[PDB]
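Predict the structure of Peptidyl-prolyl cis-trans isomerase FKBP1B.
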Amino acid sequence: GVEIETISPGDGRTFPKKGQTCVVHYTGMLQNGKKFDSSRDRNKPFKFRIGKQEVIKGFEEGAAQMSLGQRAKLTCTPDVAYGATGHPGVIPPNATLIFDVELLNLE
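Done. Here is the predicted structure for Peptidyl-prolyl cis-trans isomerase FKBP1B.
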């Protein structure tokens, strides 16, 4: 399940589509936990495309449910990214994921 909680400003019409490479300032956070990843720290805002199953499932649906300039708040279930598996040493199995996502993209 992907549940959108948008900090207001943006346009609300420029939606990401197929074959489009989009630029995202993500910020990882564990529920009742600390950080685990940050695009803000590496200063390389993670250019990636849509439709190749590159990213996890909950982050994939949340990008299409945003527009340019918007700032949503993603809440990923365990079963869409790592809940049965657990990312080794970084994310335990059966974990709930929190993200602050801004969409400042091209294409």
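The beta strands are 21-30, 47-49, 71-76, 97-103.
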